[PDB]
Design a protein around this ligand. Structure first.
Ligand SMILES: [Mg+2]
Ligand SMILES: [Mg+2]
Ligand SMILES: [Mg+2]
Ligand SMILES: [Mg+2]
Lengths: 72, 66, 110, 93
RNA sequence: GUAGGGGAGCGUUCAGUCCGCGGAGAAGCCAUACCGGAAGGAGUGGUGGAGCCGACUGAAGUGCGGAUGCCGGCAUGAGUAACGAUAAAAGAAGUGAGAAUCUUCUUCGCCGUAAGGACAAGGGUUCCUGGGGAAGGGUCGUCCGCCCAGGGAAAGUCGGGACCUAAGGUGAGGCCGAACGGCGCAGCCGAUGGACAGCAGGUCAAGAUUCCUGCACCGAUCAUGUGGAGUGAUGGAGGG
RNA sequence: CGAGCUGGAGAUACGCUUUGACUCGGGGAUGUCCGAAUGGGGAAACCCACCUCGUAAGAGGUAUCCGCAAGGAUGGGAACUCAGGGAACUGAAACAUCUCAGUACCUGAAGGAGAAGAAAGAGAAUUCGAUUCCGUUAGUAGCGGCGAGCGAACCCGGAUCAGCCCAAUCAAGCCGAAGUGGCUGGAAAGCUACACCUCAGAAGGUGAGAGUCCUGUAGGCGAACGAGAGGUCGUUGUUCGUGAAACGAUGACUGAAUCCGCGCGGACCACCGCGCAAGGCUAAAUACUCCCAGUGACCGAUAGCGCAUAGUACCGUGAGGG
């Protein structure tokens, strides 16, 4: 869970065969349709006083520029 | 028992008139246990008196102190 | 189970009233009301008399014979009488006592 | 307070024979303690307790009517006084 | 005439309508040799003791011999198998409506590293007294661990707590995780262990290292004297 | 309210009540110990403390998370609501995409409702004008191992009807009309003869069947003081299953314009047309039924709730079952 704007949740992973060719070749049959979860990262940042916290890598950018409510 | 002749009495007199009944109320229990309890009504009545007493010494506690 | 609610735990007499017994045996017979049980719907009038036996071994001598005592009724006696028979009630006001409401019908005496 | 705590005097034949030795027995509040119980007797009767032994006691009757039954739960306190014994006259019951 | 299709109807509960009946006796139940082509329907009588038939129309939880169907009652096996260790039992006396079985006396026999005695766990008043005698007791009970009432259980020193820690449990801060949550230093909980002051007797119907008699011990607060100046942690060590 | 009461209780004794008991309607005051449980511990209902006031009794305080502080949060709710997570039996007469189904279940948050809501929209008339719900369109359009099967929306009719803000009467209760004689019967309310009331012939009771005997009913009164962005990769939502797949949505990487500007219109281009995201609130119509009242071609004791009351007895270490 990334400190500025919460994250974590995710969904399913398909996997087809008979793939590629003649526009739609013959077709693409599925053999998977399972279930997955995607994640992020952490770095030390503090606003108010002392705090280490979890830092969303695509909000580690957001902070290296203009302090979006929190600071380095 | 119930009117303004009861509330008119002092603070240490209220505590005194509570325990006076309790001394009898205990003697009635000692009588009951032995088998000399010809007046069971006295027990109900004495307990009622202690209730009224305690009710009043809480009415006058809130009044004045707002 | 229910019991005497069919009315309203409300009677039409007091433990003093003189009442005539309408309906059943003891029809027309009159008497003073000596016990009024409102919820139970019971009347102890000097009317219906019974002979009750006494199951009394240890209970104050084994000499527990037969007793002369009257057995209670319901609304099978029309309350309050003056023109010699049973009546309803309609005219209330006050006597010397304002707080009290009396009762009366085609006449005006209870 | 003083007057509460001691619910009733222990009747029986053993307490009545203890009575004769200046040993008084009482049914007291189960929650009441030895110090608290000693105080109440010393006060209400005006006599010095030289010793107090006490112990809790259970219940459980029924006669008829399949009404389970139930305990009752008491506490009995027995006291010894110095040569200046006796309680009221409520000993020769 | 089987599966099956088609037709006409009988019966049950509820409903709307109409005609009624009923404590000089309704429904239900019971008996019957009467009626209808069948499902079925009526008469009479007997029981019952307060509700109900007929006709039309409407609606259904509407018709049972079966499902090793469900619930309940009762049969058969049958006065049969058994009455739960092959450690025996006998007589006398007693009690009582009643006695192989209850009490008492004298014998007999079985255990005796137990089939005796003391805890712990666990059970919960089963203990003692006085009564009882439905059911429980594999028979019978006058008796009982059953039923009713009353009583009985006593601690500064014995176990536990107000002390200690082990495994483990938890655990501010802290470390992780869709959530719920999972981990975790100190600390805290946690006896099965450490620590710590009382013995000898007496005796209720029923308690006893608890009550009582005798003579001890432990700690705490104060007092009176000795004494005359230190006392010694949340940390050190020894030691347990 | 106006004479009885002393709970069920079928039970005696003591008593209480017109200086108005009892009961009913409305407030207060006391409310042990446990439980969010909250001083600390704990094998719920028990152990063990400290601090303040105090003559002892006794009273008050001592949990963490928010914030200056006032003040808020922990926990409990039958079903209903939204959210995070999310089966399989089953269908496909086998099975694997698909179906069952985002169902069941777990978890979170909340309320009497919630949710949603004020067009970067629907959409093809340059019509519409927030949302939810109901009918309908319509088993149409479409999706689909194009199989089993799944299945919209716009228009129209209807319930209700709001848009606002920021950032630069009902419970307590009282009053209430009018039948008498004979007969059958244990008992009259039935039968019979004359009688009345009706704004009341709804209903229960009373020895049998009740307008006129009781309680009531129609009708009326009634309370001190009580409530009402775009992109690539991965995926997915809806009729959306990789299809020509647009649009929303977002885990990873990237990353713009600022009104001769941006997004949409089912790849994509131009033209024509609809609309201003990246801030927040927002009643009503809708849903459910622990509880309350009324009613019924609902049941009447193997029925009806499991119970004419019991979640008891009994069973189980427990969940649970009964
Ligand atoms: Mg059969
Ligand atoms: Mg640990
Ligand atoms: Mg029956
Ligand atoms: Mg129940």
């Amino acid at each position: 869970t990334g400190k500025k704007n919460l994250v974590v949740n995710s969904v399913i992973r398909r996997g087809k065969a008979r793939a590629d060719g003649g526009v739609g070749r013959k077709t693409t049959g599925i053999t998977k349709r399972v279930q997955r979860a995607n994640l992020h990262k952490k770095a030390i940042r503090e606003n108010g006083q002392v705090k280490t916290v979890w830092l969303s890598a695509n909000a580690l950018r957001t902070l290296s520029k203009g302090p979006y409510k929190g600071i380095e | 028992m119930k009117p303004s002749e009861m509330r008119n009495l002092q603070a240490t007199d209220f505590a005194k008139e509570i325990d006076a009944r309790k001394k009898e109320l205990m003697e009635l229990r000692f009588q009951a246990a032995a088998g000399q309890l010809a007046q069971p009504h006295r027990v109900r009545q004495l307990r009622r008196e202690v209730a009224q007493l305690n009710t009043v010494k809480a009415e006058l506690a809130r009044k004045g102190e707002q | 189970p229910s019991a005497g609610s069919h009315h309203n735990d409300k009677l039409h007499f007091k433990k003093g009233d003189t009442v005539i017994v309408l309906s059943g045996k003891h029809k027309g017979q009159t008497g003073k009301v000596l016990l009024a049980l409102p919820r139970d719907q019971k009347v102890v009038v000097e009317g219906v008399n019974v002979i009750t036996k006494n199951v009394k071994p240890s209970m104050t001598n084994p000499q527990g014979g037969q007793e002369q005592r009257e057995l209670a009724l319901h609304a099978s006696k029309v309350a309050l009488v003056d023109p010699e028979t049973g009546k309803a009630t309609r005219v209330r006001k006050q006597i010397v006592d304002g707080k009290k409401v009396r009762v009366a019908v085609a006449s005006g005496k209870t | 307070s003083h007057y509460d705590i001691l619910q009733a005097p222990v009747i029986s034949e053993k307490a009545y024979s203890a009575m004769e030795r200046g040993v008084y027995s009482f049914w007291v509040s189960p929650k009441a303690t030895k110090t608290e119980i000693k105080d109440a007797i010393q006060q209400a009767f005006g006599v010095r307790v030289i010793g107090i032994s006490t112990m809790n006691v259970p219940g459980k009757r029924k006669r008829v009517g399949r009404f389970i039954g139930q305990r009752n739960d008491r506490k009995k306190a027995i006291v010894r006084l110095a040569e200046g014994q006796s309680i009221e006259a409520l000993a020769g019951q």
